[PDB]
Amino acid sequence: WXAXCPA
Amino acid sequence: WXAXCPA
Amino acid sequence: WXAXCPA
Amino acid sequence: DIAALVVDNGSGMCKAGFAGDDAPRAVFPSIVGRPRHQGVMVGMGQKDSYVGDEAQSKRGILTLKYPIEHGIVTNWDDMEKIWHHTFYNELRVAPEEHPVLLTEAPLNPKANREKMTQIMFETFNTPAMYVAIQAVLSLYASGRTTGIVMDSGDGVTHTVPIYEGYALPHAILRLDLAGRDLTDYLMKILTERGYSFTTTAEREIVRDIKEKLCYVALDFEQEMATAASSSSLEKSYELPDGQVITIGNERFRCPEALFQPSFLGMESCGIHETTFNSIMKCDVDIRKDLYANTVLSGGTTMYPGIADRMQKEITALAPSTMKIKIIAPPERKYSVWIGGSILASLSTFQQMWISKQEYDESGPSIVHRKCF
Amino acid sequence: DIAALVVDNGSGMCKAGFAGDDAPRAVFPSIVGRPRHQGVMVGMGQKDSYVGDEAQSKRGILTLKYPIEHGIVTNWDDMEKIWHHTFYNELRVAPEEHPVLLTEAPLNPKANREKMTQIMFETFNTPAMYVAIQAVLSLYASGRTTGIVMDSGDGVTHTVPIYEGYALPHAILRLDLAGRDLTDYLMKILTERGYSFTTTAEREIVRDIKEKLCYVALDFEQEMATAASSSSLEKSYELPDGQVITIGNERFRCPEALFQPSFLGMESCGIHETTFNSIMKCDVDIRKDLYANTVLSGGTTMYPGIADRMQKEITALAPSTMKIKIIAPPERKYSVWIGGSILASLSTFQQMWISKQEYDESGPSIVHRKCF
Amino acid sequence: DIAALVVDNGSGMCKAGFAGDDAPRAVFPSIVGRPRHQGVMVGMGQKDSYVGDEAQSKRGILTLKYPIEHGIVTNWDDMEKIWHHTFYNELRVAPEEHPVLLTEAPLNPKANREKMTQIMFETFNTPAMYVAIQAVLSLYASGRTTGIVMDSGDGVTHTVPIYEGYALPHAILRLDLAGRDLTDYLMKILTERGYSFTTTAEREIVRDIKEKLCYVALDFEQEMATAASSSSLEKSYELPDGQVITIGNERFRCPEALFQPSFLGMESCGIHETTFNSIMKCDVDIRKDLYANTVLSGGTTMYPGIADRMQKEITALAPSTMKIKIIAPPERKYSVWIGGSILASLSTFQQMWISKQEYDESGPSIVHRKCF
Amino acid sequence: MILLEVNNRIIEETLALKFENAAAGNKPEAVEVTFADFDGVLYHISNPNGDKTKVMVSISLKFYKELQAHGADELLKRVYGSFLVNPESGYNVSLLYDLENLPASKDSIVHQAGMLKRNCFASVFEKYFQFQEEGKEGENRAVIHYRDDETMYVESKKDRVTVVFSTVFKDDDDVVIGKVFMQEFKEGRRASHTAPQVLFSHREPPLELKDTDAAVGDNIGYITFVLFPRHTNASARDNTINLIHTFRDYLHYHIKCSKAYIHTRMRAKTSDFLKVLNRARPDAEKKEMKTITGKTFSSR
Ligand SMILES: Nc1ncnc2c1ncn2[C@@H]1O[C@H](COP(=O)(O)OP(=O)(O)O)[C@@H](O)[C@H]1O
Ligand SMILES: Nc1ncnc2c1ncn2[C@@H]1O[C@H](COP(=O)(O)OP(=O)(O)O)[C@@H](O)[C@H]1O
Ligand SMILES: Nc1ncnc2c1ncn2[C@@H]1O[C@H](COP(=O)(O)OP(=O)(O)O)[C@@H](O)[C@H]1O
Ligand SMILES: [Mg+2]
Ligand SMILES: [Mg+2]
Ligand SMILES: [Mg+2]
Numbered sequence A, B, C: 001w002x003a004x005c006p007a
Numbered sequence D, E, F: 001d002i003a004a005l006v007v008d009n010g011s012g013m014c015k016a017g018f019a020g021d022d023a024p025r026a027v028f029p030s031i032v033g034r035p036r037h038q039g040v041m042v043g044m045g046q047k048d049s050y051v052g053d054e055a056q057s058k059r060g061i062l063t064l065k066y067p068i069e070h071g072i073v074t075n076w077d078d079m080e081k082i083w084h085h086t087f088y089n090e091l092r093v094a095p096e097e098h099p100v101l102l103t104e105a106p107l108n109p110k111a112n113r114e115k116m117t118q119i120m121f122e123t124f125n126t127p128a129m130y131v132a133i134q135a136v137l138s139l140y141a142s143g144r145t146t147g148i149v150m151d152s153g154d155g156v157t158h159t160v161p162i163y164e165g166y167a168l169p170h171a172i173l174r175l176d177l178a179g180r181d182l183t184d185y186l187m188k189i190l191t192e193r194g195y196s197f198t199t200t201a202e203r204e205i206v207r208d209i210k211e212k213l214c215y216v217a218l219d220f221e222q223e224m225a226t227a228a229s230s231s232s233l234e235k236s237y238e239l240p241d242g243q244v245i246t247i248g249n250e251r252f253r254c255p256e257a258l259f260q261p262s263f264l265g266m267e268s269c270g271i272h273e274t275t276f277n278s279i280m281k282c283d284v285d286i287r288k289d290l291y292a293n294t295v296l297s298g299g300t301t302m303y304p305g306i307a308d309r310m311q312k313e314i315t316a317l318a319p320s321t322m323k324i325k326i327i328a329p330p331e332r333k334y335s336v337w338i339g340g341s342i343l344a345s346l347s348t349f350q351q352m353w354i355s356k357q358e359y360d361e362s363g364p365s366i367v368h369r370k371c372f
Numbered sequence G: 001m002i003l004l005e006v007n008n009r010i011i012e013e014t015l016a017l018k019f020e021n022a023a024a025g026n027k028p029e030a031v032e033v034t035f036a037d038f039d040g041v042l043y044h045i046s047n048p049n050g051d052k053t054k055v056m057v058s059i060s061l062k063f064y065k066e067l068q069a070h071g072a073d074e075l076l077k078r079v080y081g082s083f084l085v086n087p088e089s090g091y092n093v094s095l096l097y098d099l100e101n102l103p104a105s106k107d108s109i110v111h112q113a114g115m116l117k118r119n120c121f122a123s124v125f126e127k128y129f130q131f132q133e134e135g136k137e138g139e140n141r142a143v144i145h146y147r148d149d150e151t152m153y154v155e156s157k158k159d160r161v162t163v164v165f166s167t168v169f170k171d172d173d174d175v176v177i178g179k180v181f182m183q184e185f186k187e188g189r190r191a192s193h194t195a196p197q198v199l200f201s202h203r204e205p206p207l208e209l210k211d212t213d214a215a216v217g218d219n220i221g222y223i224t225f226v227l228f229p230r231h232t233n234a235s236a237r238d239n240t241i242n243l244i245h246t247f248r249d250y251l252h253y254h255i256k257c258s259k260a261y262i263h264t265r266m267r268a269k270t271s272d273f274l275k276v277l278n279r280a281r282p283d284a285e286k287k288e289m290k291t292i293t294g295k296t297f298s299s300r
Helices: D053-057 D076-090 D110-123 D134-142 D179-192 D200-213 D220-229 D271-280 D284-291 D306-317 D332-343 D356-362 D366-370 E053-057 E076-089 E110-122 E134-141 E179-193 E200-213 E220-227 E271-280 E287-291 E306-317 E335-344 E356-362 E364-370 F053-057 F076-090 F110-122 F134-141 F179-193 F203-213 F220-227 F250-256 F271-281 F287-291 F307-317 F335-344 F356-360 F363-370 G009-023 G064-068 G074-083 G106-113 G116-123 G126-133 G172-183 G237-280
Strands: D005-007 D013-018 D026-029 D032-035 D062-065 D100-104 D128-133 D147-152 D157-163 D173-175 D235-238 D244-247 D294-297 E005-009 E013-018 E026-029 E032-035 E062-065 E100-104 E128-133 E147-152 E157-163 E173-175 E235-238 E244-247 E294-296 F005-007 F013-018 F026-029 F100-104 F128-133 F147-152 F157-163 F173-175 F235-238 F244-247 F294-297 G033-036 G042-046 G054-060 G093-098 G142-144 G151-156 G161-167 G197-201 G221-227
Touching: D005 D332, D013 D076, D013 D332, D026 D053, D026 D076, D032 D053, D032 D076, D062 D200, D076 D110, D100 D110, D100 D134, D100 D332, D110 D128, D110 D356, D110 D366, D128 D134, D134 D147, D134 D157, D134 D294, D134 D332, D147 D271, D147 D284, D157 D271, D157 D284, D173 D271, D179 D200, D200 D235, D271 D284, D271 D306, D294 D306, D294 D332, D356 D366, E005 E076, E005 E335, E013 E076, E013 E335, E026 E053, E032 E053, E032 E076, E062 E200, E076 E110, E100 E110, E100 E134, E100 E335, E110 E128, E110 E356, E110 E364, E128 E134, E128 E335, E134 E147, E134 E157, E134 E335, E147 E271, E147 E287, E157 E271, E157 E287, E173 E271, E179 E200, E179 E244, E200 E235, E271 E287, E271 E306, E294 E306, E356 E364, F005 F076, F005 F335, F013 F076, F013 F335, F026 F053, F026 F076, F076 F110, F100 F110, F100 F134, F100 F335, F110 F128, F110 F356, F110 F363, F128 F134, F128 F335, F134 F147, F134 F157, F134 F294, F134 F335, F147 F271, F147 F287, F157 F271, F157 F287, F173 F271, F179 F203, F179 F244, F179 F250, F203 F235, F220 F250, F271 F287, F271 F307, F294 F307, F356 F363, G009 G033, G009 G042, G009 G054, G009 G106, G054 G116, G074 G093, G074 G106, G074 G116, G093 G106, G093 G116, G116 G237, G126 G151, G126 G161, G126 G237, G161 G237, G172 G221, G172 G237, G221 G237
Parallel strands: D005 D100, D100 D128, D147 D294, E005 E100, E100 E128, E147 E294, F005 F100, F100 F128, F147 F294
Antiparallel strands: D005 D013, D013 D026, D032 D062, D147 D157, D157 D173, D235 D244, E005 E013, E013 E026, E032 E062, E147 E157, E157 E173, E235 E244, F005 F013, F013 F026, F147 F157, F157 F173, F235 F244, G033 G042, G042 G054, G054 G093, G142 G151, G151 G161, G161 G221, G197 G221
């Protein structure tokens, strides 16, 4: 992901 | 709640 | 170590 | 001097104070936090659980739980701790020295207020207590004797018409749709941009985002087209780690769920139709007086431009000869408490408490006979 | 011409085949390998980047990267390489002669599927394409119309209930917890015994151990007490250099994370509570049917003894009157692909493809309205 | 109060002292020497195993063996010899009368601490012991209960983040890369100049060269281009036999391996990226407090200009609004011991011992219950 | 242990020991063991007239008269077969095991011998379960004096079985904590989607106790269970009988463990107050380092 978690 | 919905 | 790396 | 305590004790934010003031003394989120790790450092703050602002400050290493859900207490071992922290840590006053004025949403399980009375009398030994409906206190704070209150509480929305001080208990409407549901909806729709918020410490950040950037649209389709055609409606927010997010179209889609529950997969109708139906439930000869005295309340009606949307919707619904006037004071976030500080301070009210000996005689079921 | 391609390009393993078949033509790990040492032998078949089985075989001198992680595509160049190797090498068929049906986990950043469409129409130049929720396809494969499906791939777990063909989009739950995280937890807990697997090449060995020795315990505390008072639970695995290791207690502590994410420091609930909550999110009248039609899916649900554990947990959560039936098919590794094939081979589906002209007319964003 | 021996005994150098002081009483390299030639001069007294400083002084005729490698005890007889020399020769105290606080790196095999407890209870008959994690003690020594400790010893590097005392055990990153690997790498790169150190007695000379001349370059490529274009970085060191050698480019090429292990042919990330990853694995609400409380320790972080390099490298990976503080005290080498003396001198620590009686009834399996 | 168990340990132990001694072929030795149980029950395992080959297990109960009523021995007979003999003088029920005619699988008869009190109770209780199963309204409703100052009023209707516990505790501390433990007993039906309707009352007795002699008063509490045909069917009535049988003893047990629970929190708070006092002791300038034993260090 972009915010929260990686991906 | 007890029946219907959570609470 | 036992598996991986020496130690 | 000795005066009754007024404890709002909402679903999302506990507000307590002394009667006779114009502002709550203590305001803090009604959450309980417990650590989910194991300390390793000797002697450094090893305690069972944090409550209130202390839990918000240390929310990184705790799991936060709300005791009240949809206006209903679902964990009494935590509600007791909330009230204990209110009495001995926030107000810092003995509980058995002042009467208490609690609030409860209408159309609620009788067991809720029965247990409220039992806790207030058996545990804290208050000499007197009372459980008033929130919308009635909001109307008292507004400073009038007729109108329809629409308390969009954070945990629960409800409308209670009142005429000349005569509440109509057959036109009251309750809708379990409020700030926490909008927070969850924002968490669900933020994933489209790519921001993933799962844990409760992140739900707090999402609430801080909602409470700051979200706003209600005067016309939904128009705003959607505007946000799609031009990147002039996006806002930037900095998470508490340095990351920066930019939310656009989402801004007015979160509060739009209030007017369209179909987004949240509910069969219910928007708050505008709820208020209109609660008005049409009344007898005709008073409806006009309600149309011109619609009052908002609760922290979920603080969204910018909600008065305009509500007025437009109701004007479209109601006939074209009635004057619609959405009374929205800029202090609505505390109206439910403010009216309390009024009601507990009146001189014609001191004979309506539930005295301790009345309870000792008639059991906790006396709340149904005394409190309306 | 006809028989559109079906490419379940989920995390961990890409599975591609033709429509109308009962098994994927080419299944292979979706990894991109790059050499990490200088070449000294000239003219010996030196290539810049290996993909799939080629990378798995020569993983000794390669660094491996997955282009997908938790369901989102992080490195689009490697993903393009994967798709190219899938089309030309593993299938030997041009992409501009067949439609393609990809897959995607629900609640995914829209940029992901938008870029998927843009790549499929601008690089490989397909005549048509489609994107489907992997859970719906897994339900297609089971030949049902009612039921809840709990898919769990390499990097994503998600539950999607569907009643009479109407998927409830508000009860769909997602949880980033799958093979990848279990393989990391195993790499961590193996150090307890003394085995250290650190580099990305040994992650494959650890994954082979996890998918050969691990098993879900029917009672965690009892199995822990048993494995601590006996040696009947130890199994020996042989590394690919002759070294033999023995793992005991670990065998069931790895999959147990699925039912207790607290091991991984995650706050979220287990997969059993996730499924139960997803069911309880739905309307009352249907909660019965879902109880009798829980359909497991995904490779991560191929652990021996996971059906029994899930059944026990749910029947301990759900009321006693209702019946719990875990529909764990004999094969469920390719169930999503089987459902995709069955869908693509349907005669009523040919009016739901995203046509080339439609993409050229409305751009990539059309994927948000043509696909659900 | 009671006096408790604190024996760090990490890899590389054993540092033992009494709890309550500010510096270890005895610090000596943990090596064991064995004569490799015939004895011809009888009557002068001979020994078959030299330990510590005596083995260092006589290294010309010995085969120095380290009993600990990469933080793991690999030869228990030499470890017992080291402990005996520590107890009866350096401290000159009876071990059967004082508690012992040993240290172990995180994520080591359990057999290590098990055999450590068994040795300390069945050979020296210590009345009580305790096995603490090194980084936690390092944080004790810094006088703060929040921060990420980055301990880089002689055989192992590891980071542990702690918030308000609640250490996060799911974000502890270990990395087998420390002073000994750097010493071997320096031995390798010193050949290209023309000097060849190949025997285990000259590895000590190479280690002295490293810890006297080597340093960390703030900008690696700029320093390379500088030292490769002018003789202004060359330093001359005198061997113990009169020879003088001159090292230039090598000076900062040895420690640079810490920030990019691709030189040693390893795949793992540098120590800066390891610390940043460890931070990013923690929850979002505490990262800002970790960034401003990064702590270094171990004698491998005593390279001139490593704090500035770590700050410049982390600042490039962290958002532009987070303030990065590298708290590197000039007593970093002894920090792990200094925190130990702080811990073993506390009042409540007497309730955390492993009493000899408690072991006599439960065997070595008690350390996993009494010490995390 | 959270839930009290229904099988007595002394009976099982003694009978298993006797059966092991008899099965191995050893000569039988004398046995005379008297003991007690919950609710004032008195057990006596002995030999009839010094006959060292027979072992008689007798039990004296408090619901003396309710078990002598016609039909109150169907379950006892059904479960115990030929072991059921005439009561020993002074006791109420009596089993008689012949150490020479013991059938194989000696575990089952001992497992059913340790539940003698539970079976005597379930025999006088399944009468109303049957009165409700057979579809008859207005069947006999009685008051089992399962203790000496407390009663259990059982009533069977066409569609339900009502059990009203009239209960009172002996000690003052136990009374004060039992008021709480019984007030908070309706908050249990939130732990299961299927739990019998529980009603608590201490202001006034229910309308079921107005024609009967169940103990009433101003210090007694009334707890009404309404067991429906999903708790009294022929497949889940064993658990229901066990729970209705051990309810009062379980409440007493947990009232007496609440104190040992509170003591830990009180010790914690005592230490927390000692830590606040410790701010008054002036920190020493130099301490002499001692040994684990406490003797002088004997070295630097
Ligand atoms: N200015 C605002 N705009 C939008 N939402 C708000 C605003 N202020 C508060 N809220 C939301 O509304 C709720 C506050 O309601 P509140 O008056 O505290 O009622 P309660 O006591 O039931 O929580 C919170 O959930 C908060 O997230
Ligand atoms: N039999 C098994 N036991 C344990 N884990 C498995 C097994 N089969 C597959 N897995 C793991 O589950 C993950 C998902 O498998 P798969 O069906 O290929 O879905 P995906 O295509 O999303 O990886 C894989 O990464 C694999 O490591
Ligand atoms: N002041 C220094 N400058 C540069 N290098 C140093 C310094 N002190 C120690 N080192 C090197 O760091 C290596 C490991 O540090 P050390 O403290 O021995 O680890 P440990 O604490 O586990 O014994 C040693 O081999 C030494 O050569
Ligand atoms: Mg409120
Ligand atoms: Mg899958
Ligand atoms: Mg160290």
